[PDB]
């Protein structure tokens with residue numbers, strides 16, 4: 001591993017094209033960077049250096065565990081436990097609820113001085129900087145990753161997306177394209193969301209779009225090459241991709257309508 | 264019980280088990296927790312924080328070590344040691360301790376969750392901070408000085424002053440920080456001092472301050488622990504979920520610890 005510092009990461013982010021004063025949605029891997037002097041704290045500081053005082057950093061802070069136990073599959077739980085879990089699950093707390101599968105950087109980021117987290121109990125985002133409150137305000141149940149969500153806010157704020165040591169499999173912005181596009185064979189289903197109600201949760205059944213993630217690599221690579229101003233490069237030891245979210249999401253809508261046809 | 268023989272443990276079950284162990288409502292409580300020891304916690308670390316907040320109540324105070332031992336000189340790193348060439352770079356480029364940003368190391372999921380709770384506050388020592396929540400939180404974390412990082416003018420001293428209790432939740436006397444308060448207070452036979460480098464925050468950089476400190480001796484923790492505990496009036500042993508738990512009065516125990524070291528420690 002290469003010894004990588006706060007200053008080196010910040011300079012490499014500027015070399016990739018991270019706009020001072022811009023809104024930046026970050027999908028980060030800590031272990032891909034090399035050996036980070038100061039670890040996840042050094043990564044967060046370098047990202048704040050890159051965007052500057054007038055910039056904004058946004059990161060997914062998903063808490064997938066706050067979901068019906070019948071859906072659980074990494075460690076599935078006994079069926080006899082399901083009703084106790086449903087009644088006793090603590091409600092989402094933006095300060096207390098940890099992230100799952102988001103990475104050490106977002107988990108370190110969410111608590112930063114000035115960082116604010118959105119209200120969705122499963123798909124919240126944390127933001128820091130000039131437009132942080134706007135990014136996280138009124139995150140609705142209707143389209144958790146679409147209209148009235150922080151993904152829509154990054155779009156309206158003409159932000160960039162940084163894939164830092166991870167690829168299109170972590171590209172949340174494709175979900176914004178999925179909600180906006182009536183592509184052939186688009187499906188819906190009913191989901192259970194635990195909505196906070198004091199010290200308890202109130203399970204609310206809601207309809208939602210069924211996401212499709214199999215073509216993320218083919219769609220990403222095709223949309224990325226057609227996104228004007230995009231860049232590829234190395235930040236530390238990590239392979240990185242930087243792109244304008246607006247142009248890219250609009251191309252993803254065009255890709256889904258032309259190339260998706262579900263069984 | 265699941266495939267892995269773990270039993271379902273809930274926030275309400277943990278708070279009641281804590282009340283049954285003897286956790287006092289309105290009291291100051293210093294916690295040393297293991298999440299895996301508890302069983303399968305419904306809501307994980309967040310459910311342990313909430314159950315501990317329920318046990319002490321609104322008038323109570325929770326305190327936990329939030330140590331960030333990586334903020335030390337690279338020459339001392341052993342678990343993951345780094346090339347000697349990197350040491351001057353590491354010394355120059357290490358970010359300063361930030362109470363909001365710096366993660367804990369070796370503290371566990373519960374402390375890591377706790378430190379960010381609404382109303383929790385964290386002390387200023389770059390290696391040995393504590394986080395506190397509740398009625399006397401600000402008092403507990405306020406005076407964190409360099410002279411005795413785990414002694415006079417440290418959150419361990421505030422727990423003592425406020426007549427707090429100590430909870431060892433699924434871990435034992437190897438995690439008992441209160442022993443360090445006794446170590447500073449007692450001139451036991453072979454007590455040593457050494458010099459240590461502490462990175463002090465200086466804006467965006469660290470300033471490496473060499474300071475004198477007491478050398479901690481930890482090999483007798485279990486022997487001293489069992490001896491002081493059995494003589495601590497009103498202590499309790501019990502079960503919190505699946506975890507073996509110990510609850511004791513910090514003032515009486517720390518005082519017994521000082522007497523134990525004077526009588527049984529003789530360092531060469």
Ligand SMILES: CC(=O)SCCNC(=O)CCNC(=O)[C@H](O)C(C)(C)COP(=O)(O)OP(=O)(O)OC[C@H]1O[C@@H](n2cnc3c(N)ncnc32)[C@H](O)[C@@H]1OP(=O)(O)O
Nearest residue numbers: 027028029030031035036039060102103104166169170171
């Ligand atoms: C359907 C959808 O698309 S939405 C989901 C959106 N997802 C995201 O935004 C997540 C974006 N991030 C990713 O995708 C990533 O690839 C991840 C987090 C899932 C995987 O990345 P990893 O690098 O494997 O994990 P992470 O970033 O948590 O790093 C911790 C690892 O770094 C290492 N590490 C620890 N300290 C340091 C340091 N100073 N320097 C370098 N590495 C370190 C350790 O190897 C650690 O592993 P351990 O904690 O098991 O010992």
Ligand SMILES: CC(=O)SCCNC(=O)CCNC(=O)[C@H](O)C(C)(C)COP(=O)(O)OP(=O)(O)OC[C@H]1O[C@@H](n2cnc3c(N)ncnc32)[C@H](O)[C@@H]1OP(=O)(O)O
Nearest residue numbers: 295296297298299302303304307370371372434438439440
């Ligand atoms: C010199 C001195 O005396 S001062 C030092 C004082 N130290 C302290 O106060 C720390 C107090 N804690 C301890 O001593 C503990 O024994 C520790 C933290 C060192 C080890 O405890 P562990 O239970 O092994 O770890 P921790 O509490 O972080 O729990 C995480 C483990 O819980 C498990 N886990 C995760 N979710 C759940 C859940 N819902 N339910 C139950 N277990 C879970 C996983 O195994 C996890 O480990 P992973 O992150 O590898 O997946």
